[PDB]
Design a protein around this ligand. Structure first.
Ligand SMILES: CC(=O)N[C@H]1[C@H](O[C@H]2C[C@@H](C(=O)NCCS(=O)(=O)O)[NH2+][C@@H]2CO)O[C@H](CO)[C@@H](OS(=O)(=O)O)[C@@H]1O
Ligand SMILES: CC(=O)N[C@@H]1[C@@H](O[C@H](C)C(=O)O)[C@H](O[C@@H]2O[C@H](CO)[C@@H](O)[C@H](O)[C@H]2NC(C)=O)[C@@H](CO)O[C@H]1O
Ligand SMILES: [Cl-]
Ligand SMILES: [Cl-]
Ligand SMILES: [Cl-]
Ligand SMILES: [Mg+2]
Ligand SMILES: [Mg+2]
Ligand SMILES: [Mg+2]
Length: 429
């Protein structure tokens, strides 16, 4: 009889079940994203098969699907293995350590240990390891009360805390980091339990043909730095922006962006470009503040120089609509002017670089890349060269000389992250 691996290879497709959420798998007009989506896509490529994503609305359904006749090959969904073995399911080697955290609302008193969870309105996801944690606690503190939802995602639980619908929830630290940027009031109360490893889940039984390939792949993903890169993209917001930076973005998202969103959308539509990337530029430049001012005379929401403003037909840099339109037009123009050899998505990142440092200094970095045997059409390569423009040992012999290339790297990195954050916004219940 055909093995699990042989079935997949024969069918030419790897069916992967997951949750529908930015952390795992998420659809947006510009494509599909998610930590689990990208990791599973790489695994399917390793196997030389097509990835087919299936989703479940809660964990019970996810595990039921995995254990059904005709079910998917594996589940990739930020799964925490249960405390006890169950014949219905087997787990891979773990690929991410996360820490469960009790989450509370700033403005209310912070519980600091498990006993403080008594007397609170708590909600967690049904069928979760988090629910098990509380069930175990309830044996010690019978007055403990908590509710379980089988019809929402973690973003919804965190929103409930943010607006005061509940007092507390319990989530994985990576989920908190990803969502901190949406909820200005949520805070970590304390770490509840030891860190644990997330793992892919396979059907029960004694067929190890696919499992061994999964584990070989995960080890390779770790070695290549793929796990780290995905971790940083999806779960790195607090690591990179800082914790205060993260919940401060959340405040600005709630209070400032609604004042300007229509302008960004208007400009994006007329320029045929994603408004959320435009908005991300605006956040990095001014934190969405139309009266902002840099040290060097640059002003406004999109931080246009007077030269750029004039060139774009901006007559008032301090007017949010004009700044947005001018900055957006400029970004689009310089993206269009990039060498044809630079392809998307890299092309957009090079355009961000040029927005900040100008096309001339950017060309110097591309020339440097080529000289170093790197690919001048790949952003990740040229990004390595940009900081050299701030160092005399490198910039003195370049055509255009000194430039703050380190700043530019930071600029592009931050805008790309804010762009992701805006793309991953979901609607409340
Ligand atoms: C939107 C805009 O006006 N960008 C201009 C950019 O300003 C940057 C400058 C930066 C800035 O002022 N950073 C702060 C420096 S400091 O903290 O005040 O010292 N912010 C602006 C947009 O990202 O400088 C470059 C390079 O000269 C210009 O390229 S060039 O015309 O081809 O030379 C580019 O036009
Ligand atoms: C140290 C730091 O974090 N500074 C931030 C500042 O960036 C400066 C230039 C820096 O990193 O040294 C940043 O200000 C904007 O930075 C972008 C480039 O990333 C510039 O193009 C803008 O002109 C700058 N705007 C202003 C008003 O200075 C701001 C917020 O993004 O935060 C600073 O803490
Ligand atoms: Cl999420
Ligand atoms: Cl620099
Ligand atoms: Cl980057
Ligand atoms: Mg749902
Ligand atoms: Mg999980
Ligand atoms: Mg210069």
């Amino acid at each position: 009889a055909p093995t699990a691996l042989e079935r997949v290879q024969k069918e030419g497709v790897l069916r992967v079940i997951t949750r529908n959420s930015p952390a795992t798998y998420f659809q947006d007009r510009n494509g599909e994203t998610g930590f689990e989506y990208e990791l599973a896509k790489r695994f399917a490529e390793r196997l030389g098969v097509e990835l087919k994503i299936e989703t479940a609305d809660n964990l019970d359904d996810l595990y039921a699907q995995l254990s059904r006749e005709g079910g998917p090959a594996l589940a990739a969904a930020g799964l925490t293995p249960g405390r006890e073995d169950d014949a219905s399911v087997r787990y891979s080697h773990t690929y991410l350590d996360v820490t469960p955290q009790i989450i509370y609302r700033n403005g209310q008193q912070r519980p600091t240990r498990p006993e403080d969870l008594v007397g609170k309105r708590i909600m967690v996801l049904k069928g979760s390891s988090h629910a098990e944690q509380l069930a175990e606690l309830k044996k010690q503190y019978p007055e403990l009360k908590y509710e379980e939802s089988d019809a929402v995602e973690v973003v919804d639980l965190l929103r409930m805390v943010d607006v005061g619908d509940i007092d507390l929830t319990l989530v994985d630290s990576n989920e908190l980091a990803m969502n901190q940027v949406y909820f200005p009031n949520v805070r970590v109360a304390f770490d509840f339990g030891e860190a644990r490893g997330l793992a892919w889940a396979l059907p029960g039984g004694d067929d190890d043909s696919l499992m061994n390939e999964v584990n070989a792949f995960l080890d390779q993903a770790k070695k290549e730095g793929l796990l780290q890169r995905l971790k940083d993209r999806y779960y790195g917001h607090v690591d990179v922006l800082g914790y205060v930076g993260a919940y401060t973005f959340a405040q600005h998202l709630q209070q400032r962006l609604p004042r300007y969103e229509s302008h960004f959308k208007q400009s994006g539509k007329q320029l045929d470009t994603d408004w959320r990337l435009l908005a991300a530029i605006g956040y990095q430049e001014s934190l969405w503040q139309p009266g902002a001012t840099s040290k060097t005379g640059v002003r406004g929401l999109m931080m246009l120089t007077n030269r750029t403003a004039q060139a774009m037909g901006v007559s008032n840099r301090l007017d949010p609509k004009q700044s947005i339109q001018g900055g957006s037009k400029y970004f689009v123009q310089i993206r269009s002017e990039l060498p044809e050899s630079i392809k998307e998505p890299d092309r957009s990142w090079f355009a961000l670089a040029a927005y900040n440092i100008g096309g001339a200094h950017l060309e110097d970095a591309r020339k440097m890349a080529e000289k170093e045997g790197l690919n001048p059409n790949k952003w990740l390569d040229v990004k390595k060269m940009l900081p050299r423009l701030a160092q005399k040992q490198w910039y003195a012999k370049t055509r255009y000389g000194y430039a703050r290339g380190g700043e530019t790297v930071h600029f592009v990195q931050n805008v790309r992250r804010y762009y992701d954050i805006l793309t991953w916004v979901t609607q409340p219940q």
